Amino acid sequence: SLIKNPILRGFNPDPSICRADTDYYIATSTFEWFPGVQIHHSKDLVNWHLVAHPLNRTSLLDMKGNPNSGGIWAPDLSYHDGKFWLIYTDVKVTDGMWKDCHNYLTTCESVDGVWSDPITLNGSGFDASLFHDNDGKKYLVNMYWDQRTYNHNFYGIVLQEYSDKEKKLIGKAKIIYKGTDIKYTEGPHIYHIGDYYYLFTAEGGTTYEHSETVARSKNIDGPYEIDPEYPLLTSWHDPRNSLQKCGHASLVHTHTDEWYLAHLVGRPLPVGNQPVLEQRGYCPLGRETSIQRIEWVDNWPRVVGGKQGSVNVEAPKIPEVKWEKTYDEKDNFDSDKLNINFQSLRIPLTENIASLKAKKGNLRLYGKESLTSTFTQAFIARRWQSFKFDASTSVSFSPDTFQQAAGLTCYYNTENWSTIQVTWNEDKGRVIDIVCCDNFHFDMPLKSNVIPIPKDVEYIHLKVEVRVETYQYSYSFDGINWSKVPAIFESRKLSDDYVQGGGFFTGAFVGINCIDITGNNKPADFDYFCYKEE
């Protein structure tokens, strides 16, 4: 069988792969999207399904007010002593001389279970990872941040013993490794294999310069020798490769005695007839997860097929297990549980923000704050996972002020989004309008040419057609006949590469929202949500 990369499409960065007997799991980072930490499962490493988000209660994860691309950075998922261990990081400051954050540990018998109250770790840097050694000792490793303005911020990798008995870090923390001249040394994981401790790190930063390198030591404290052939993984030198930004990896040893390496990538939109070294590309699907096969040479791991990483990869010798889709293309909102592929921003949804119970067969969003708010938005959304797809919904809404709007939205962060809305105007009553924000530049391109909605229309149908480099919205008053709204958007503008600011770590979403600035919590009822990839 063949692995066809990427294995986890759309926004799914920083893969932490972990084996539990013959089950395989990957944890990916979720940043401001709630509930936190995606966990996907596989039997064969080829086919994956989404199965859990452990961080689903305020006591585990409180991101109210968190900056864009703050919150959950690279997660670390392990399996030891018969249970799963999750190290996660809440990032509070995403730019400037500091990166204030807090690391925590939680555990659970199963990935989809009720995770334990969190244990407080440290905050010396992000990318915390829990290593379970073969002598029963446990160690936390993370990057150590140097805020000093005349120094590179990535001071190296710190190691400190973790005591499960005391439920805290113990002993002295030590810097064990400083990285290579590529720098941005982060993503540490340790593996004790045969004669060595192997320290895997990401380097170069999570852009086109991304890489993974491996160092080794006979003792856990180092010093570590660097692979003479470093990096292990990178496509920096090959701008034509389908998989770019190859780094932030983690290693798995299969029950079939084979070796695979999960890592993030970006897949740029077509760059066209433009300088291939200069214009490396825009990635609206964010950072995704791929897996490479590893072979060993002179006691160093090496990527089969070359450092750049390959698209089609020989799968492990395991019977094929494909999964049915975890969502319906047309979700009629007939269940009381919101589909696992939907997230909301920063905080748990409550019945005062969203309800599937108020009116059977509908999702009712009670209007809250605007698309620019980092507090409470009545907004659920799912990832773009293809460059070509249709998404649609229909909504009943009776706004009586321009302070009320409900609609379909393509969204990256609070200053990068577009939306088609049902809202209201003094002279025309209920109308369809377009609103967008392009790195904090706001526009309403239709101006007075909004589209009036007849009083007798109950559900207004709204659709977006995403077609690689561009996308466009349409509406329908009968669910059959659609009309195009003349605002065409560039997909590249909902990409990690385009958005401004220190945090550019998520990806494009498509979703539905209800805004009510007045405080009246006006309800909008959505009859369905469609997502269909082409």
Binding site feature residues:
332, 361, 527
Site stretch for its own copies (CB under 8 A), options 15-23, 303-311, 333-341, 440-448? 440-448
Among 179, 383, 176, 408, smallest CA distance to 286 is for 383
Does 527 help bind Ca ion (rule: CB under 5 A)? yes
Q: Which of 73, 126, 131, 333 binds Ca ion (CB under 5 A)?
A: 333
Kindly report the three-state secondary structure assignment for every residue of 69-122: CCEECCCEEEEECCEEEEEEEEECCCCCCCCCEEEEEEEECCCCCCCCCCEECC
Q: How far is the CB of 366 from Ca ion (least distance, A)?
A: 18
Does 361 help bind Ca ion (rule: CB under 5 A)? yes
Does 374 help bind its own copies (rule: CB under 8 A)? yes
Residues 37-76 that bind its own copies (CB under 8 A): 64-66
Residues 322-351 that bind its own copies (CB under 8 A): none
Q: How far is the CB of 40 from its own copies (least distance, A)?
A: 30
Two tokens at 5?
A: 């990369």
Q: Is residue 523 within 8 Å of residue 351, measured between CB atoms?
A: no
Q: Which of 82, 194, 228, 275 binds its own copies (CB under 8 A)?
A: 275
Q: How far is the CB of 113 from its own copies (least distance, A)?
A: 27
Handedness of CA 244, 245, 246, 250 (dihedral sign): negative
Does 96 help bind Ca ion (rule: CB under 5 A)? no
Rounded CA-CA distance 402/424 in Å is: 5
φ and ψ of 413, to 5 deg: -145, -170
Please provide the DSSP assignment of 42-73 as one string.
ESSSSS-EEEE-SB-STTT---TTPPTT-EE-
Binding mask 500-529 for its own copies (x = CB under 8 A): -----------------xxxx---------
Residues with catalytic roles: 14, 186
As a whole number of Å, the end-to-end CA separation of the chain is 24
Site stretch for Ca ion (CB under 5 A), options 53-61, 188-196, 268-276, 359-367? 359-367
Q: Is residue 376 within 8 Å of residue 449, measured between CB atoms?
A: no
Paired strand residues for 68: none
Rounded CA-CA distance 110/51 in Å is: 11
User: Tokens 């919150």 — which residue?
Assistant: 71
Q: Which does 374 bind (CB under 5 to 8 A by kind): its own copies, Ca ion, none?
A: its own copies
Does 389 help bind Ca ion (rule: CB under 5 A)? no
Residues 202-241 that bind its own copies (CB under 8 A): 204-205, 209, 236-237, 240
Please provide the DSSP assignment of 387-446 as one string.
SEEEEEEEEE----STTEEEEEEEEEETTEEEEEEEEEETTTEEEEEEEEEETTEEE-TT
Q: Which of 184, 224, 417, 475 binds its own copies (CB under 8 A)?
A: 184
Q: Which does 64 bind (CB under 5 to 8 A by kind): Ca ion, its own copies, none?
A: its own copies
What residue ranges bind its own copies (CB under 8 A)? 64-66, 92-93, 96-98, 100, 102-103, 120-124, 145-152, 173, 181-184, 204-205, 209, 236-237, 240, 273-278, 369-370, 372-375, 402-403, 415, 435, 437, 440, 442-444, 447, 517-520
